[PDB]
A paper describes a structure:
[name] ([name]), belonging to the human type-A Enterovirus (HEV-A) subgroup, used to be associated mainly with herpangina, but in recent years has been increasingly reported to co-circulate with other members of the genus such as enterovirus 71 (EV71), CVA16 and CVA6 causing hand, foot, and mouth disease (HFMD) outbreaks in Asia, Europe, and North America2,3. Like most members of the picornavirus family, HEV-As comprise 60 copies of viral proteins [name], [name], [name], and [name] arranged in pseudo T = 3 symmetry, encasing a positive-sense single-stranded RNA genome.
The capsid proteins [name], [name], and [name] adopt the classical eight-stranded anti-parallel β-barrel configuration and follow the expected pseudo T = 3 symmetry, where [name] surrounds the fivefold axes and [name] and [name] alternate about the two- and threefold axes. When compared to the structures of EV71 and CVA16, the external surface of [name] exhibits five additional continuous and “star-shaped” dense protrusions surrounding the fivefold axes. These arise as a result of the loops at the fivefold axes, in particular the [name] BC loop, which assumes a raised configuration. However, compared to EV71 and CVA16, the raised conformation of the [name] BC loop forming the north wall of the canyon and the refolding of the [name] GH loop (front part of the south wall) from a short helix to a more extended loop moving away from the “star-protrusion” broaden the front portion of the canyon of [name]. In contrast, the [name] EF loop (back part of the south wall) of [name] bears a distinct conformation and moves closer towards the “star-protrusion”, narrowing the back portion of the canyon. It is quite likely that these conformational changes of the canyon and neighboring microenvironments, including [name] BC loop, implicated in receptor and neutralizing monoclonal antibody binding, together with the alteration in electrostatic properties, determine the specificity of [name] for KREMEN1 during host cell entry and specify the antigenic sites of [name].
Numbering used by the authors:
A (entry chain A): 2 to 8, 18 to 297
B (entry chain B): 10 to 255
C (entry chain D), I (entry chain D): 19 to 69
D (entry chain C), F (entry chain C): 1 to 240
E (entry chain A): 150 to 198
G (entry chain A): 51 to 198
H (entry chain C): 1 to 48
J (entry chain C): 145 to 192
Write the structure that this text describes.
């Protein structure tokens, strides 16, 4: 009472179960009404349509729109990692850890990077074979070591007691292991691009190795062993396939045309930039 | 009733006689953080008219060889006005922006500028090194240019390794010297967390690029600047402490 | 269409957890107007954009 | 227990199969969601956005001048300017468009494309052009008397700086597979040519040439099917 | 074993270990020679009717 | 019988999986329950109990004097006394608290902490202190003019012998992972410092120094997620 | 000095905003905290050449391995059920197709004296027969304490 | 889980057996049908 | 939330014994006041503890 | 950069040929005496 100055989105949603129909349109002879002329300086795309440009027939369109949703586009398993467990003769560790980063393999990386923010679940399958290829009847242990948890120091070391860490016991002759994983980010979404630094302080101008590394993506480590006492002589790879499910996506961004170099960095060649479209002989020959 | 606009924010205001609509990024307005999304318990501060208002950077001059410039937000504003002070004494920042770009010339000039807004805009090292040890990275003065802005080494791939032609996915507009002399975009707060540190993290960069180069026939004006004026709509600050510039 | 009395069951879950389940329930929702035409003043297709 | 009889498909791992798997963390409640601007649902929303066709994609186009279409005052009237094939999932000027990347993860497409041209001249530059579209058939039209026979739109340079040539879906099939030719060249969509309607006419004291910028998008009719893996990417060794 | 479907326009694998086997999109079947034979259902994929 | 098709996940043993197993003893009825005092249901009940922060955890602190904070009459006013990081799942004075052990079985935490100080002096000892909390940022405050800028509470020695500095949750994320720094130092919570507000003033004939005892706990807001195995324990061989 | 913890709260110490808090509390219950399998024991069966017993007994004490021991010892009294899994491998590691017998010998019951000895007739003692190539054995066990 | 007992006929592949198999393409909608003249239903129409 | 018509079944038991089953039915019950504040005379947060 | 901090108005040359900078009353007193400075310079209004 004594001091008065103290006292939405335009876009909406619509279900689309099939491709758009086409209504019939005849010609137009008159002034003042001009569907063709656009001005792109407003950042908005041309709203001109089939039916105001030419004369059209009527098309009932039963083409399905369904397969292109982000759920169906992103729910497929593809390789996020490869782990090499020697365990054999000579120098023998007896186990191998793999930090969980799905940016290590390009084919599934470029699909994710269409988007800035993502919130999903996961389905991991572990396909393990021997050096060339085979399956023998050896028991395996796949253990998840979340951030802050002790990493195992040896084949038999006590960190494999896994009274808490989830683990999978499986034989090489069994069908590949599989589990469901939740959304574990301490933020509200995963983000594949973080423009910023994780901590305060003075940042070197010569080499910034901390630029662009989001803390919220550090999920812990995956570790393998052969359950045993002495050692085996075999040598095996485990391939790791991640499926995305229940996925949501935000803020689409352009698709990367340059060859990747590093996992965690978008470094590209200042020399050698490859053109996004192949070159022809002349602009006047379509072919 | 279209090409003439006035924008009034705080004690500042902007008029333009030549304008192409206004872009509202992703169809939302800036807003204060709702009680359901918030996490930090302490009470944020809301200065309103002292922070939210138009700040005007220096002008970038416009040449035939120019490859284009970029800025980072809030970073450009962290040293200026009362907005720069609040962001130093608080650990938690949230707000949107209203971006306005002025470039004018005369009916005998020509060119076009792409103005975009890129959420989480990550610059990229330039080199053939595939080892994360020997591989180059950009410097802090590059990643976060400040008021002085930065420039593109490779404007075609946007320095991030991504084609410029697809930049039209971001909220954008063009300055086409035959059509409009300004471009205005109103950006909501975008981030994966409700609040963040204005110092460590920049939400989005701004980009001005010559897709079509400046041309003028001799005798006309050679000096064309590009001025930038940005206002922080709907600001909040939390986690009050001592002052940290970086 | 068709498929008279096919008695489909998929979404039935065997675990006490929601993320154990299988996609989707789909979604048919679209909002292209936020990416394609994100402008304050609405522009009709008949009228010229700039007047 | 319950007598069972196992079938082929046992022990196979199909990447696209929809099944339940065991949770690792019983009782896990994830971090609350918040509102984030710019959510996407389907990728067809992203195919309706205009991005820049690279028509000058030829050699000696330097780096960023590949996106520009030079227009100047001609001498012989009725001249061709630029031409590109309509196939959005085919190597060419569509290879730089967003709609060109997404139709390249799928085996087939159907719908109406759209091609927007923006002329960046001086205010004093005037001109008319003819943007023509010819369905499949004899090769690229030789003349504008041949190119006027197709779908065309005349465009006057002026206050409104863009025209759009809509490319209606004209096909025998419901879909078109995106692939190279000699066999799959059955599915070629057509040819866009851009001709001088009159001329690029400019007063004295003004630059003697300008640039058109071309963009491309889709209409509400456009769809896709049979998702696959793109050809643009190549990897050799595990990224370190 | 790996049985992968490479639809028209998709890159064909160039080697045993080549990257086209990452199959982030292409459907694939992983199976042991000692497992019962693989089996899948396929739709009507013709671009005509 | 019923045709079945087996899936990946067959024959795997997942430690956290929820399944039925066969009973060994059919018809077994266990020994009747009785009422026992002190039942626990969740571990968050145990995290709300104050246990003793070991602030003097430094070297040459002997055995049990590690839990005490020496307070005496200063000379230069405005002096620092003790400081510790707020991260309860981090190496330091929180490593001896019950809430420090339980947040160390989990990958993440969220909530408000609480720090209780109890001054054991003589009845005749008076004084004031400043218990300040500074959110993440520049390092430990250098002055009390810098430390007053944060969250602080002034405390007068008197009849009631304890004050509590509540440490509100101030974060960009909903959770904070508990781990070491250099990268995860993104999640550091802040710094508690304890300054002389005025001075420790004591009459004649009374001891010239005393000890504060600090304790720590959680508020109703505190939670945890992603249970894992602790780092404090080490085993070598099977215990005989 | 009253042994009671400070009841002071966020809201009376400073000025606060309103926070609707949807963080889940569920994962920290004693059910979810303690329901995980972890190693309670290891049994070495030679059966090989030279000196050969042909069997090995393991007295059931789950205090033998520290990692699961420290979780239990947070509490003085516990009443629970159990799920035991038996993962058997060979010396280095492998699975051959040999048949096994896992027998439970409750207090007072005769312990087997030999590989073939009669106490393996198990007309009463519960036993599990399993091949090394089979997925690991598993059973549910009740609360067997004669106290409460 | 549910105790089961496997029977003879396990792992056999019978060419004429009627079973469900896994789809390769989730969310696939085929190209619309059209009317085509001369549809056949049974082969006895062709024997007449 | 969400999960419309997911038809969840877990607690169904295949044996005649109660301990054969699977956890939990959960529990949301808490009583922190017995461990945290186990004092005869109740003390408010406003008042000073000792008077 | 110092002058943008005050009350300002940006003005584009064009069809409408005039802009107006309104100078709001910002004062500690209700009135300002009009006189020279050194003492009465207390009442100075500001700078355009
Ligand atoms: C029994 C073994 C289970 C293994 C469970 C591992 C789950 C880990 C969570 C995966 C979620 C996606 C991974 C995070 C995203 C990217 O990798 C980030 N760039 C990491 O830096
Ligand atoms: C077919 C083989 C089944 C094996 C069944 C064994 C069940 C034994 C009951 C286990 C209950 C927990 C064990 C007792 C607690 C600690 O070990 C005590 N400290 C023992 O001294």
């Amino acid at each position: 009472d004594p001091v008065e100055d103290i006292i939405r989105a335009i876009s909406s949603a619509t279900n689309v179960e099939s491709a758009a129909n086409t209504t019939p349109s005849s010609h137009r002879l008159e002034t003042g009404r001009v569907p063709a002329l656009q001005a792109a300086e407003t950042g908005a795309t041309s709203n001109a349509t089939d039916e105001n440009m030419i004369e059209t027939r009527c098309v009932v369109n039963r083409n399905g729109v369904l397969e292109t949703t982000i759920n169906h586009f992103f729910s497929r398993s593809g390789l996020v990692g490869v782990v090499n467990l020697t365990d054999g003769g000579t120098d023998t560790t007896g186990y191998v850890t793999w930090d969980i980063d799905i940016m290590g393999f390009v084919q599934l990386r470029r699909k994710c990077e269409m988007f800035t923010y993502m919130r999903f679940n996961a389905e991991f399958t572990f396909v393990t074979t021997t050096k060339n290829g085979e399956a023998r009847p050896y028991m395996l242990q796949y253990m998840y070591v979340p951030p802050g948890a002790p990493k195992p120091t040896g084949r038999d070391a006590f960190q494999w007691q896994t009274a808490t860490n989830p683990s999978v016991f499986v034989k090489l002759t069994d069908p590949p292991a599989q589990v469901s994983v939740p959304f574990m980010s301490p933020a509200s979404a995963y983000q594949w691009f973080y423009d910023g630094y994780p901590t305060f302080g003075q940042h070197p101008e010569t080499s910034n190795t901390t630029y662009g590394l989001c803390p919220n993506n550090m999920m812990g480590t995956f570790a393998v062993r052969v359950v045993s006492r002495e050692a085996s002589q075999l040598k095996l790879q485990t391939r790791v396939y991640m499926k995305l499910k229940h996925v949501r996506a935000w803020v689409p961004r352009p698709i990367r045309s340059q060859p990747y170099l590093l996992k965690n960095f978008p470094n590209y060649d200042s020399s050698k930039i490859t053109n996004s479209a192949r070159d022809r002989s002349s602009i006047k020959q379509a072919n | 009733s279209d090409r003439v606009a006035q924008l009034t924010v705080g004690n500042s205001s902007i008029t333009t006689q030549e304008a192409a609509n206004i872009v509202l990024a992703y169809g939302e307005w800036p807003e204060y953080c709702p009680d359901t999304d918030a996490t930090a318990v302490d009470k944020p501060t809301r200065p309103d008219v002292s922070v939210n208002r138009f700040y005007t950077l220096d002008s970038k001059m416009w040449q035939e060889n120019s490859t284009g410039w970029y800025w980072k937000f809030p970073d450009v504003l962290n040293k200026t006005g009362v907005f720069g002070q609040n962001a130093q004494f608080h650990y938690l920042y949230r707000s949107g922006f209203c971006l306005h770009v002025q470039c004018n010339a005369s009916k005998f000039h020509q060119g076009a500028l792409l103005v975009a807004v890129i959420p989480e805009f990550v610059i990229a090292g330039r080199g053939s090194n595939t080892k994360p040890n020997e591989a180059p990275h950009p410097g802090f003065t590059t990643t976060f240019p400040g008021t002085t802005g930065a420039t593109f080494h490779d404007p075609y791939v946007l320095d991030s390794g991504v084609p410029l032609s697809q930049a039209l996915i971001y909220p954008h507009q063009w300055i086409n010297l035959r059509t409009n002399n300004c471009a205005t975009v109103i950006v909501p707060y975008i981030n994966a967390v409700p609040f963040d540190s204005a110092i460590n993290h920049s939400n989005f960069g701004l980009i001005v690029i010559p897709v079509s180069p400046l041309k003028y026939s001799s005798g006309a004006t050679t000096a064309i600047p590009i001025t930038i004026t940005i206002a922080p709509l709907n600001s909040e600050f939390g986690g009050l402490r001592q002052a940290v510039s970086q | 269409a068709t498929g008279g009395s096919t008695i489909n069951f998929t979404n039935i879950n065997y675990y006490k957890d929601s993320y154990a389940a299988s996609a989707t329930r789909q979604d048919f929702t679209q909002d292209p107007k936020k990416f394609t035409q994100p402008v304050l003043d609405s522009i009709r297709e008949l009228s010229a954009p700039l007047n | 227990g319950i007598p069972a009889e196992l079938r082929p498909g046992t022990n196979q791992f199909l990447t696209t199969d929809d099944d339940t798997a065991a949770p690792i963390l019983p009782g896990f409640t994830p971090t609350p969601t918040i509102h984030i601007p710019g959510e996407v649902h389907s990728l067809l929303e992203l195919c309706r956005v205009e991005t820049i066709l690279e028509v000058n994609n030829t050699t000696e186009a330097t780096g960023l001048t590949r996106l520009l279409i030079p227009v100047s005052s001609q001498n012989k009237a009725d001249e061709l300017c630029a031409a590109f094939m309509v196939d959005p999932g085919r190597i060419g000027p569509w290879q730089s468009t967003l709609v060109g990347q997404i139709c390249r993860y799928y085996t087939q497409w159907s719908g109406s494309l759209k091609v927007t041209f923006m002329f960046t001249g001086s205010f004093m530059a005037t001109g008319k052009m003819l943007v023509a579209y010819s369905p499949p058939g004899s090769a690229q039209p030789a003349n504008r008397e041949t190119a006027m026979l197709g779908t065309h739109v005349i465009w006057d340079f002026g206050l409104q700086s863009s025209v759009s040539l809509v490319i209606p879906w004209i096909s025998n099939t419901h879909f078109r597979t995106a692939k190279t030719g000699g066999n799959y060249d059955y599915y070629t969509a057509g040819v866009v040519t851009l001709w001088y309607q009159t001329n690029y006419v400019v007063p004295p004291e003004t630059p003697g040439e300008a640039y058109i910028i071309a963009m491309g998008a889709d209409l509400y009719k456009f769809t896709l099917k049979i998702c696959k893996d793109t050809d643009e990417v190549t990897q050799q060794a595990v990224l370190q």
